[PDB]
């Protein structure tokens, strides 16, 4: 059982992947509110910018 | 984009620590191998050992010889260094966790791929001695000879998925991950990894004890400790790259409720750690390959089984229509 | 000679332009929406 | 793809078949195309033979001259035939056997 | 913009304007005859005429301040 | 007798021998079956 | 198919976004002619909102930015 | 889709043989058990076998050349004047190979990939005359260029060839930058680079007051591009020292085919084209500089190469008198210019290479040649009294065009610098008669004959020269066949 | 204002590539002025150009000139010049190129001058072409194989000629 | 102003070019280098007017300049071996034989 | 969209912060071989390669048979270089 102590800097990478995505996400959805959209378009872009206008102006 | 640099360290700051903690887990499986223990005794089950190494580092007085390239010879680090952080910025660890997504994605790390060389190059002529110049010509050739390699096999994964965004790369793989059919694309894609890296069994700059000084044998203190670094964050990436092409990213294994019960990110390291396994597992089962040898493999073997492979995959699919 | 623009060897454009006129990356961009 | 084998120079001669396909003009293959073709290839056989003597490769450069015929060879015989289904050359042959098929 | 082929996937810019002074060309057998399309071809291409009238807008305005 | 000269050759060299197959499967798939599922198609 | 899904939802709230856009570009390019009317006062031979084009065929204004849609 | 492809048969044929030849070379070079055999014979022969069939392929498919216009419109464009055009290229290469046996025999070079380089570039040369779109045209201008460069420095333990090739490149990537450079202010400023377009675009207008600039100098560039090709002063310091440096053969090769290629690229863009008056002064007063330095410097010579190297830039200067008028006469003239200097260039590098066994590099070489091979001396007689333009030799016809033009176009300073060059050229021509005839040298060299395929090729050309004014009717013909098909 | 700093960047890295005493360094500015024009190219929106920029002249162009010309070792007598006294000549060229050069443009292509009016308001956006846009990659990759598809075949001879005169001019085989 | 900023830094490489020709003359390498400037200049120029008249035309002819400014490239530095291996140094004394 | 490219911009920025904070905090207490120009040159036209496939490989779906038979032409011409460099002894480095 003494091969446990390698699994050990082993787990502390990839709980270290684990924060750099996380983390990440977390911060991203607070500022914007909401979880960032995976594939972000010129169609995308255009209705963020028009729904602005149709929100803060209604 | 203020909260941006607080994205960009939470990646930063992490990878650093993990990198530090590979080393000891090098260190810790290797030896188990050779039924011994391993950093011990530095905290408790050796824990503490990449913070000592690091303050140790850090505490070294630099040396900077007397060489007309006072400037490229600390630049170097520096470059090399950057290069691997960077390439993290368009890594996708989950379904919406990536600081960049890119639809070039795929051709911005074959590019940081193709940057890498030039911290070598400059490493081995900055430094006045012949040795380490010769050393670093052979790792850069070596390098650049096993991007072609490299490449291919991204071109063949692009094929498939018809898309440079990571992320769509990792979504296409949800029927079916691009390593069953393309097992024999993975294989060769982690020697080419491991070639690239400059690891074993390709792992010229260690083979002091061969005649062959390595790019780095003048530099000391942090210097020293940057190149090792940035080659270090370079494994984890090439390993997080074999993940995310050919094992479905952060997708589990299979499309089952029990599985989808724990989060992407957990898979997504889980397979990293597998592939940061298998580079310490052959690093402790093989010899190395002289110069001349893989140099041989590279061109000889893998140049030539890549191509042939972009050209079967893009012919069957383009014969029964399969295209994405 | 008066016009050699006029000549039919000198309007190959004008000719094989309508046959690709219906090729995507260059259609007037609401075809797809009647289409 | 789009394509159009419209010609600049229409053709004076009858024609047969406007784009003929490539077995249909194999098939229509005269006594004199393959004169040409066995003319062409046999002179590049010749060639690869008289110049391999010198370099002691008489039988290679034999089989390299005779590639190199009978690829020719076959493209002249082609153009011929296509060129007389098509009306670019004079094809009576051609208009006396589709004036009864 | 004479190709066609747009840089974002589409029909060009300035391909209509191009066409219309093409054909307008194929028949006229003086080139005077199609003097109006070929400016509208290359006030597409670099809007040379509306940029200077824009500017002699922004000059009165300057003037009057 | 060119049928052992080709064992040899693949003997010899397995790695341009396998190229070859996997390139020339490639190859055959697109000028050949694609023009018989076309043509299958067509009737 | 999740693509041609996804072009389709899209397809069919085009006509109203366009509609909208069309509204905002009328009354914002009226007022840009009144603006241009009032400026242009007392000079001789200007005419307000004239098409450079001599076909008069409908332009968009141009803006004068080599790449401003992908940004 | 098969029968499209009918138009770039001959291409695809003369492509597909240079790679059999180049698999065939560097597969049985390399080969132990034929103890390495030099190959560049063998693969001469089959070479030149492969320029004469695509030469069939080319000639007896005249109608089908033309096959598919419209889907080949935007890669290329293939008439009678480019039909011509080609069939010249191709016996042009047809010649320089079978003048290189010996070379290869007797000095022993015995790379084969000299005979593959050729080959491209006669790939390179058949795609530039038949270009009609500015990419297109640079692709096959720096395929040509490229090929150059390295058969230029195919001597490559020698002093002379290094330098050569290293000249070439430096000076031939400076101008093709330059060229490129004149094709994008083009672009920019039309937005288009196929010649129909570029075509109607700039018709009818010239300058008109208000001239595009970019227009006008990327016409400017590309000129300049294009007189440095063709060696025009002050674009043709590369010339002399690249014709030396090279091994004689690619001396004998660039002095001919690429300036078929080049000039029809120049017509096909400049005459078809439309900026006018400034692109013919471009060229006619490059043409005087060129007459006159060619002239000069060929006077101060004393070795045979460097000598043929300005002749043939003083008859650039002749020959682009014709394209300056800009008139039917002036293309039919520049073309039969271009044909009879091509035949009179073949011939005397046919005795250059057959000199070259005993090593000729200096005029006085060549003293009291009539004694030890009396009908060699004749023959190089005829051919420098055929440069000097001495009637009835085919050289005068190209001369009587110079003076019928300047008293055509009406311009009587170029006809006294026509009057004054010949009879400097007359001069450095005759002296090489009076070395081979009236000299009493003390110590004499014995040359070695020629091998059978200079000798044939010698006698033809020779028959040529002194017997084409009597029967000049099918050039006459051809040329003013070209000139017309240049517009219809 | 990006595009100022850009350009002072890419024209002092420039000046260093024509001026360093030591033509290593100079290989070394002229990657600088390889990634300054990257930048550029991201400006435009043409991200495929940008990256191939870094692919082809900073990882392969670049590479092959470092590996010669390091291993060459050239002294810095043998290429030494003073530059002083070409001064008088690189003015009148460079000012006669410049006064007609960098203005050449400017009666074809007038620019816009910036008015104290938001112009931004009068931008129209056309939704139709923004259901299934083109990235630049497969914009060009439409157009490179099927209708340009000969120049692309030329380009291919133009790199065999490359890889044959490679082997032909250096090859000493042991 | 923004189609003659993007013209302006193109030129600006171009010029730099003609001076690293202009400026050289004993170094001969630095004179290959300035080739390969006025080359970049020139494709940044067919791609900047590429966007500029929504034309596709200018990107092929880029990518295809490339491959060309490759090759260029490869052929010179092998001529530039040749010449040093030769001669044993780069100096453009020993370079100027050929003459008259 | 070029939006996703200032993230990138802004990491190289901390990425270089750090580099310099670790090199700088311990500053407070004649022999030419010509086979690395031919694996330059020979990386350089695979490099190349990869650049053409690029926009073929995302392109396949819409160029179809054409498309593919052209690449195909093209790798024929460049492996057939690749050839006669492997019979020359470029790829060999004892
Ligand atoms: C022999 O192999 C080894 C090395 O030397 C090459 C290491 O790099 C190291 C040590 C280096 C590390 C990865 C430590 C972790 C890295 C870091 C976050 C920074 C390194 C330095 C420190 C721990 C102290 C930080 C101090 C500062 C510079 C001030 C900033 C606050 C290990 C583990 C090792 O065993």
Redesign the pocket.
Known sequence: LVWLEAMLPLGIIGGMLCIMGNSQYYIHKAYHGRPKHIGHDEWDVAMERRDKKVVEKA | YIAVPAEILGII?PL??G??FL??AE?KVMAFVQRRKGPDVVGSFGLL???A???K??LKEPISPSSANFFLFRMAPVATFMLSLVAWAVVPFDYGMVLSDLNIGLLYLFAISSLGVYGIIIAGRSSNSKYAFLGALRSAAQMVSYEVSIGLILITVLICVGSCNLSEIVMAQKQIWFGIPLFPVLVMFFISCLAETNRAPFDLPEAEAELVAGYNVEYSS?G??LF??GEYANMILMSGLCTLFFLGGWLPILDLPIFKKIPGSIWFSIKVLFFLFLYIWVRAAFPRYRYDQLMGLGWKVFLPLSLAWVVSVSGLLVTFQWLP | PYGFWTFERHNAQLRWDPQISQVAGRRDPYDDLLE | MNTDITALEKAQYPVVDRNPAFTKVVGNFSTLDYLRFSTITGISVTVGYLSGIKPGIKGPSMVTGGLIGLMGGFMYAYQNSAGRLMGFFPNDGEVASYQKR | MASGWGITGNKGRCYDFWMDFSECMSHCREPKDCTLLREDYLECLHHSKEFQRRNRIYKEEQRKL | PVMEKLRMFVAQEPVVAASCLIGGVGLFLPAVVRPILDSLEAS | ALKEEKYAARRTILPILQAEEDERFVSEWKKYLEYEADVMKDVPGWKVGENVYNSGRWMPPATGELRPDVW | MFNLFLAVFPEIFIINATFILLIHGVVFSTSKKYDYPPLASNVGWLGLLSVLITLLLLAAGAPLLTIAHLFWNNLFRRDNFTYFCQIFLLLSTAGTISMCFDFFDQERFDAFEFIVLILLSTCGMLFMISAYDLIAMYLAIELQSLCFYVIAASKRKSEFSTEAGLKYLILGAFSSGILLFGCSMIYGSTGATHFDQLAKILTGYEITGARSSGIFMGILFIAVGFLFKITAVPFHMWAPDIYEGSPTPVTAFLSIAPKISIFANILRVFIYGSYGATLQQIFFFCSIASMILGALAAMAQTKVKRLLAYSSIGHVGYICIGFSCGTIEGIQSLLIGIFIYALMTMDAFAIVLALRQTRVKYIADLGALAKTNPILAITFSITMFSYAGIPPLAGFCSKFYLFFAALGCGAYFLALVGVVTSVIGCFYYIRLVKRMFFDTPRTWILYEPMDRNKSLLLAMTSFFITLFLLYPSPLFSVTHQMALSLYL | MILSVLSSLALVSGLMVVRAKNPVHSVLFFILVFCDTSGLLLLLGLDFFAMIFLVVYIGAIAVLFLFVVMMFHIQIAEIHEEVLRYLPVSGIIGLIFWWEMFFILDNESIPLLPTQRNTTSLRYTVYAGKVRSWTNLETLGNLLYTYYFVWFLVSSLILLVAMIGAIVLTMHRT | MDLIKYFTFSMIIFILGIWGILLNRRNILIMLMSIELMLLAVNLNFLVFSVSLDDMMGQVFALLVLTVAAAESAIGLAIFVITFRVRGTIAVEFINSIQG | MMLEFAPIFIYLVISLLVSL??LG?PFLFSRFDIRFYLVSILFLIFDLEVTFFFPWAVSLNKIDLFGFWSMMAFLFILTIGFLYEWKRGALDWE
């Open positions: 700051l650093l620590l990198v530090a080393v000891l260190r050992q990449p913070l190494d690091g303050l580092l850090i942090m020293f400790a090792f670094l | 904070i670790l905090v």
